[PDB]
């Protein structure tokens, strides 16, 4: 159902993903860490916090949604 104007993907790194609670920082960390990722957010989960990066994936939606999904 057009979840976005473009295909967005997410991938975990191996440098700036251990101690971070600021999504803004985690974003610049990725875009600054590589050249393929154009974004990224930070999330705190066990055992320790982790950082996730985002990049301009391919395809469009590769799925559907339809109306009245349920309750």
Coordinates of C-alpha atoms in Angstrom, one line a residue:
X1 CA 0.0 0.0 0.0
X2 CA 2.8 2.4 -0.9
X3 CA 4.7 2.2 2.5
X4 CA 7.1 4.8 1.1
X5 CA 8.1 6.9 -2.0
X6 CA 11.1 4.7 -2.4
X7 CA 12.5 1.2 -1.4
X8 CA 14.2 1.4 2.0
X9 CA 16.3 -1.3 3.5
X10 CA 18.0 -1.9 6.9
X11 CA 21.3 -3.5 7.8
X12 CA 23.4 -4.0 11.0
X13 CA 27.0 -2.7 11.2
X14 CA 30.0 -4.0 13.1
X15 CA 31.6 -0.8 14.6
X16 CA 29.1 1.8 15.7
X17 CA 26.5 -0.7 17.1
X18 CA 27.1 -1.2 20.8
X19 CA 26.6 2.0 22.8
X20 CA 24.1 4.5 21.4
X21 CA 20.7 5.8 22.4
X22 CA 20.4 8.7 20.0
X23 CA 18.7 7.8 16.6
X24 CA 20.2 11.0 15.1
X25 CA 23.7 10.0 16.0
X26 CA 23.2 6.4 14.9
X27 CA 22.0 7.8 11.5
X28 CA 25.1 9.9 10.9
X29 CA 27.3 7.0 12.1
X30 CA 26.1 4.8 9.3
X31 CA 26.1 7.3 6.5
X32 CA 29.5 8.3 7.7
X33 CA 30.7 4.7 8.2
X34 CA 29.9 3.5 4.7
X35 CA 28.8 5.0 1.3
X36 CA 25.9 2.7 0.6
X37 CA 23.8 3.5 3.6
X38 CA 21.8 6.7 3.5
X39 CA 20.3 6.5 7.0
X40 CA 20.0 4.6 10.2
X41 CA 18.4 4.6 13.7
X42 CA 19.4 3.5 17.2
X43 CA 17.6 1.0 19.4
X44 CA 18.3 -0.3 22.9
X45 CA 17.8 -4.0 23.2
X46 CA 19.4 -7.0 25.2
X47 CA 21.9 -7.8 25.9
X48 CA 23.3 -4.4 25.0
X49 CA 22.0 -1.5 22.8
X50 CA 22.5 -1.9 19.0
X51 CA 22.7 0.5 16.0
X52 CA 20.9 -0.1 12.7
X53 CA 21.7 1.5 9.3
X54 CA 19.4 2.2 6.4
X55 CA 20.1 2.2 2.6
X56 CA 18.2 2.8 -0.6
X57 CA 17.1 -0.8 -1.4
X58 CA 15.6 -1.9 -4.7
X59 CA 12.1 -2.8 -5.9
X60 CA 9.0 -1.0 -5.0
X61 CA 6.7 -2.9 -2.6
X62 CA 6.9 -6.5 -3.6
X63 CA 3.7 -7.1 -1.7
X64 CA 0.1 -6.1 -1.1
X65 CA -2.2 -4.9 1.7
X66 CA -5.8 -4.8 0.6
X67 CA -8.7 -3.2 2.5
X68 CA -10.2 -4.5 5.8
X69 CA -7.1 -6.4 7.1
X70 CA -9.1 -7.5 10.2
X71 CA -10.0 -6.0 13.5

